[PDB]
């Protein structure tokens, strides 16, 4: 998870709903910008 | 490639004004020879031990 251990006992795949997606994200990217051209900061 | 470029430019260029100096682009030949001698499978460093 966010915090992990060596007690992992079941890896369960399954399609993800968008309801699960906008609760994973810690934000939202909206601009196609990588890094400033002059100062080289995000 | 040179011929292609030469003829395209010739068609665009106005007549009674142009010359092979203004037609020939020598970039393609240089590029080809360079990409051959460098960056090719069949031009290897002479192994000289």
């Amino acid at each position: 998870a966010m915090l992990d251990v060596n007690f992992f006992d079941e890896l369960r795949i399954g399609l993800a709903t968008a309801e699960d997606i906008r609760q994973w994200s810690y934000g939202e990217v909206k601009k196609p910008e990588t890094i400033n051209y002059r100062t080289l900061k995000p | 490639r040179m011929e292609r470029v030469v003829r395209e430019r010739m068609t665009t260029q106005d007549v009674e004004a142009i010359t092979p100096q203004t037609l020939i682009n020598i970039r393609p030949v240089v590029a080809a020879i360079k990409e051959f001698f460098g960056t090719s499978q069949l031009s290897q460093f002479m192994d000289q031990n």
Binding site: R22, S25, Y26, G27, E28, K30, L40 | -
Partner: protein, 106 residues
Amino acid sequence: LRGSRLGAVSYETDRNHDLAPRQIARYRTDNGEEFEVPFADDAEIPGTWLCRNGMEGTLIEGDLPEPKKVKPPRTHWDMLLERRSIEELEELLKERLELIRSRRRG
């Protein structure tokens, strides 16, 4: 080749005890979801905030400090109205009006 993502690294123990106390602030989004934003104590808490969802969210605490609306993007109406006058579009409107109503009465 040797490269590295432009950045820096620190080597200090992550003391979990002696820190600067935080203060969780609530920021309701337009849909109404709550997104916790930990702030320090001596810290001017903003009324609005860009939340985790990505839409603007206001404090759950009652502030409502003015929407601060901006001027509208130039519209097609704006780009038309300058070159042409209202009364000038009037005659054209009446021409189309008579055209369509002549179709109607027919």
